[PDB]
Amino acid sequence: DAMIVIDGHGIIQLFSTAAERLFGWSELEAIGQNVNILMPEPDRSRHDSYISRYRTTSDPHIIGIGRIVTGKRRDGTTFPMHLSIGEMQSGGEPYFTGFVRDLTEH
Numbered sequence: 001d002a003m004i005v006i007d008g009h010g011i012i013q014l015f016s017t018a019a020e021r022l023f024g025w026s027e028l029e030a031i032g033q034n035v036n037i038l039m040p041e042p043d044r045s046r047h048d049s050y051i052s053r054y055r056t057t058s059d060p061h062i063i064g065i066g067r068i069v070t071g072k073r074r075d076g077t078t079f080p081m082h083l084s085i086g087e088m089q090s091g092g093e094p095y096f097t098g099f100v101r102d103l104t105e106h
C-alpha cells in the first residue's frame with residue numbers, strides 16, 4: 001500500500017500518499033531526508049551501513065526476501081510493518097523501492 005523510493009545514499013526521493021498517513025510526514029518533508037528518520041535505534045544509526053554493505057557486496061539480506069520490522073512514526077511511536085525492497089537503475093544510478101505494509105492495522 002505505502003511506497004517509498006530512495007537513492008543509493010538512502011535519501012528519500014518519492015513518498016507515496018499512504019506513506020504520509022502511516023509515518024506522519026508529508027511528501028515534501030520526507031523528500032530530501034535520509035530514510036533512517038523512519039526507524040528506531042539501533043537500525044536508525046546503522047541503516048546507512050546496511051545500504052553501503054549491500055552496494056559493495058551485492059549480497060541481499062532483505063531485497064527479494066522481505067522482513068517484518070519496526071518503524072517509527074513522526075510522533076516517536078513504534079509499530080510493526082512488513083517490508084519488501086527492490087532495486088532498479090535510472091540514468092546509471094541505483095534506486096531502491098520499498099513496499100511498506102502496516103501490521104498494526106491491516
Ligand code: HEM
Pocket residue numbers: 004005006035038039040043047050051054059060061062063069070071072083085096097098
Ligand atoms: C522504516 C523501517 C526500516 C527498517 C527498520 C529497515 C531495516 C533494515 C535492516 C535491518 C537491514 C539489514 C538487514 C540485515 O542485514 O540482516 C536493511 C537493509 C536495507 N534497507 Fe532498510 N529498513 C527500513 C526501511 C527501508 C526502506 C523504506 C528502504 C527502501 C526504499 C530500505 C532499503 C534498504 C536497503 C537497500 C538495504 C540493503 C539491502 C539488503 O541488505 O538486502 N529500508 N534495512
Ligand SMILES: [Cl-]
Pocket residue numbers: 064065066067083084085
Ligand atoms: Cl517480500
Ligand code: NA
Pocket residue numbers: 027028029030031032033
Ligand atoms: Na523535503
Ligand code: NA
Pocket residue numbers: 065066067
Ligand atoms: Na521474507
